[PDB]
Amino acid sequence: KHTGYVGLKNQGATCYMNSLLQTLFFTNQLRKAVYMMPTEGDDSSKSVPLALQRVFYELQHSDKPVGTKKLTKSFGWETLDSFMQHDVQELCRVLLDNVENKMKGTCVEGTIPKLFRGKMVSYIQCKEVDYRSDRREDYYDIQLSIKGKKNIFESFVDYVAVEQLDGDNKYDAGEHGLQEAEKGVKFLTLPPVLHLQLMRFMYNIKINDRFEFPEQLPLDEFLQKTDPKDPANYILHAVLVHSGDNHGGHYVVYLNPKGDGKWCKFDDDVVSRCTKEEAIEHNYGGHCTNAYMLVYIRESKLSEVLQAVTDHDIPQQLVERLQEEKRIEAQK
Numbered sequence: 001k002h003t004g005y006v007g008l009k010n011q012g013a014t015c016y017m018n019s020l021l022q023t024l025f026f027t028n029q030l031r032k033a034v035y036m037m038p039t040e041g042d043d044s045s046k047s048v049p050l051a052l053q054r055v056f057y058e059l060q061h062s063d064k065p066v067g068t069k070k071l072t073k074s075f076g077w078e079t080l081d082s083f084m085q086h087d088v089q090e091l092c093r094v095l096l097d098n099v100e101n102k103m104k105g106t107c108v109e110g111t112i113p114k115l116f117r118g119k120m121v122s123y124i125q126c127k128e129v130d131y132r133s134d135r136r137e138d139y140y141d142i143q144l145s146i147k148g149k150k151n152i153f154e155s156f157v158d159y160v161a162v163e164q165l166d167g168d169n170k171y172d173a174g175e176h177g178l179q180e181a182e183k184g185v186k187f188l189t190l191p192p193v194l195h196l197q198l199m200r201f202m203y204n205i206k207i208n209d210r211f212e213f214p215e216q217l218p219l220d221e222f223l224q225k226t227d228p229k230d231p232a233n234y235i236l237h238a239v240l241v242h243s244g245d246n247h248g249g250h251y252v253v254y255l256n257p258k259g260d261g262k263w264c265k266f267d268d269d270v271v272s273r274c275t276k277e278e279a280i281e282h283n284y285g286g287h288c289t290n291a292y293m294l295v296y297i298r299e300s301k302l303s304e305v306l307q308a309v310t311d312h313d314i315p316q317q318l319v320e321r322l323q324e325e326k327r328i329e330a331q332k
């Protein structure tokens, strides 16, 4: 490390896990809140919140690559194929739901939805009658279509496009009977930290087409009502990348941890400084290396989301417990 940052060990076929864990570790406001969870009574192997606390501590203090085996055991993905049969956002949810639940009743209650939860409306509009129905939905991540899309702007256009409900899937309008209708989605809110998965793996082959994403992403036009006080501009924080064919692959994540455009590549135990071009354009696709997930941060939230974490931010009770474990282990 001429980077200051420590890598995670490759201990097994955990695919995207390591890339996702670094992305979460460098969500500093989330890291701090994780450090505050009351894990003192927890059981030292069945607790996912404790096991997340353990990995973050080590990523923050260790000079050697950090292990993840207690973490995987704690949420029960211990088989060759639990990673290959899930999406990256499904793992994230498994992680953030344990943590969110542990935070209930404490001073950090609500941190996870505060950081990751946005709101959208799904609406249905009949074409031959007055009935419209609008219903809100929460999301913690967005899955974007890429097949046939030059870029993120076009994936968003596609995402909010009007879908017809005619002939065979006519819409049931209740007292109005079956009807032709149009349906679509609009954002009401976009959260501070925006997780986008790129739908590159489809039923089971990989799509390697060129798909462009920018360092700065203006999303105002996809919101139902904009706010002149807080515009929906986002800054690219992480690029999770997969290289190779459908079957079998190499996994890296590029991050700019401090949000200043000084980029770093995290390839398991190796971490190196890289160029902006290597982190962004070189993963557009179109050798067969490319992004499958992106993390953007709302510009007006960047300072808070990436607030400096210090050693004092870890309560000593938790530091003592993790130390006693290193010492029990260190006895070979």
Ligand SMILES: *CCS(=O)(=O)Nc1ccccc1-c1ccc(C(=O)N2CCC(O)(Cn3cnc4c(cnn4C)c3=O)CC2)cc1
Binding pocket: 013, 014, 015, 016, 083, 084, 085, 086, 087, 088, 089, 143, 197, 198, 199, 200, 201, 202, 204, 242, 246, 247, 248, 249, 292
């Ligand atoms: C576990 C990696 S592997 O080396 O074992 N490769 C592998 C081998 C056999 C069968 C499947 C794979 C495989 C499994 C998983 C990925 C992968 O890294 N993913 C899965 C897709 C991903 O979640 C992004 N994504 C999210 N949601 C999606 C889609 C498509 N449609 N939806 C709703 C999508 O692509 C990223 C992580 C690669 C290879």
